[PDB]
PDB file of C-alpha atoms in Angstrom:
ATOM      1  CA  UNK A  12     105.105   7.630-139.740  1.00 42.17           C
ATOM      2  CA  UNK A  13     103.260  10.692-138.545  1.00 39.00           C
ATOM      3  CA  UNK A  14     100.587  10.966-136.128  1.00 37.21           C
ATOM      4  CA  UNK A  15      97.369  12.243-137.687  1.00 36.27           C
ATOM      5  CA  UNK A  16      93.840  12.421-136.036  1.00 37.39           C
ATOM      6  CA  UNK A  17      91.115   9.737-136.039  1.00 40.04           C
ATOM      7  CA  UNK A  18      88.071  11.515-136.914  1.00 39.38           C
ATOM      8  CA  UNK A  19      87.290  15.300-137.948  1.00 38.89           C
ATOM      9  CA  UNK A  20      84.537  16.478-136.014  1.00 38.09           C
ATOM     10  CA  UNK A  21      82.311  18.508-137.702  1.00 38.43           C
ATOM     11  CA  UNK A  22      80.099  20.969-135.209  1.00 39.13           C
ATOM     12  CA  UNK A  23      78.754  24.081-134.882  1.00 38.02           C
ATOM     13  CA  UNK A  24      78.534  27.032-132.398  1.00 37.62           C
ATOM     14  CA  UNK A  25      76.483  29.607-131.923  1.00 35.59           C
ATOM     15  CA  UNK A  26      78.661  32.686-132.304  1.00 35.13           C
ATOM     16  CA  UNK A  27      77.850  36.075-132.410  1.00 38.67           C
ATOM     17  CA  UNK A  28      73.857  34.611-132.919  1.00 37.27           C
ATOM     18  CA  UNK A  29      75.444  32.885-135.712  1.00 38.01           C
ATOM     19  CA  UNK A  30      76.139  29.048-136.051  1.00 38.87           C
ATOM     20  CA  UNK A  31      79.173  28.753-137.472  1.00 40.22           C
ATOM     21  CA  UNK A  32      80.402  25.143-138.558  1.00 38.49           C
ATOM     22  CA  UNK A  33      83.650  23.920-137.954  1.00 40.11           C
ATOM     23  CA  UNK A  34      85.176  20.213-138.783  1.00 42.30           C
ATOM     24  CA  UNK A  35      88.237  19.642-135.822  1.00 39.85           C
ATOM     25  CA  UNK A  36      90.233  16.855-135.964  1.00 39.99           C
ATOM     26  CA  UNK A  37      90.974  14.616-133.434  1.00 40.23           C
ATOM     27  CA  UNK A  38      91.695  11.417-132.067  1.00 42.48           C
ATOM     28  CA  UNK A  39      90.198   8.692-130.274  1.00 41.73           C
ATOM     29  CA  UNK A  40      91.293   9.768-126.700  1.00 41.73           C
ATOM     30  CA  UNK A  41      91.104  12.978-127.461  1.00 45.90           C
ATOM     31  CA  UNK A  42      89.985  16.228-125.823  1.00 39.39           C
ATOM     32  CA  UNK A  43      87.549  18.785-128.155  1.00 41.04           C
ATOM     33  CA  UNK A  44      87.471  21.917-127.426  1.00 40.00           C
ATOM     34  CA  UNK A  45      84.603  24.141-128.405  1.00 39.51           C
ATOM     35  CA  UNK A  46      83.866  27.789-127.229  1.00 41.12           C
ATOM     36  CA  UNK A  47      85.557  26.779-124.087  1.00 44.48           C
ATOM     37  CA  UNK A  48      83.798  23.603-123.094  1.00 45.40           C
ATOM     38  CA  UNK A  49      85.856  20.377-123.689  1.00 43.19           C
ATOM     39  CA  UNK A  50      84.627  16.742-124.721  1.00 42.74           C
ATOM     40  CA  UNK A  51      86.180  13.496-124.498  1.00 39.59           C
ATOM     41  CA  UNK A  52      86.126  11.803-127.958  1.00 43.57           C
ATOM     42  CA  UNK A  53      85.053   8.210-127.428  1.00 42.98           C
ATOM     43  CA  UNK A  54      84.113   5.200-129.603  1.00 43.07           C
ATOM     44  CA  UNK A  55      82.962   5.426-133.208  1.00 45.21           C
ATOM     45  CA  UNK A  56      84.325   9.250-133.536  1.00 46.12           C
ATOM     46  CA  UNK A  57      81.403  10.200-130.792  1.00 44.04           C
ATOM     47  CA  UNK A  58      81.994  12.618-128.149  1.00 44.75           C
ATOM     48  CA  UNK A  59      80.978  12.407-124.735  1.00 47.26           C
ATOM     49  CA  UNK A  60      79.448  16.240-124.933  1.00 46.88           C
ATOM     50  CA  UNK A  61      77.797  16.517-128.426  1.00 48.88           C
ATOM     51  CA  UNK A  62      75.026  19.103-127.631  1.00 45.75           C
ATOM     52  CA  UNK A  63      76.070  22.454-125.661  1.00 47.29           C
ATOM     53  CA  UNK A  64      73.835  25.400-125.143  1.00 42.51           C
ATOM     54  CA  UNK A  65      75.137  27.102-127.861  1.00 42.72           C
ATOM     55  CA  UNK A  66      77.479  24.195-129.564  1.00 42.05           C
ATOM     56  CA  UNK A  67      76.598  20.869-131.012  1.00 39.88           C
ATOM     57  CA  UNK A  68      78.473  18.263-132.775  1.00 41.46           C
ATOM     58  CA  UNK A  69      76.194  17.311-135.730  1.00 40.92           C
ATOM     59  CA  UNK A  70      79.111  15.031-137.862  1.00 39.63           C
ATOM     60  CA  UNK A  71      81.909  13.152-136.510  1.00 38.96           C
TER      61      UNK A  71
END
C-alpha cells in the first residue's frame, strides 16, 4: 500500500500582511514547515509549535 499522511494541518501565515491559509499534510512524527519554521507533529495531529510571530496552526 502507499504511504500517505496522518493529518491535514490547517494553518495560516502572514504573507505580505495577508493571512493566507494553507492546509498541508503530514504524519504523526513529521516535521511541518511553515515560513521557515519547523514543528514536529505530535499526538492528536497537534504540532509542537502551533503559534509563530506571523503564522499559526488553526486546525489539525
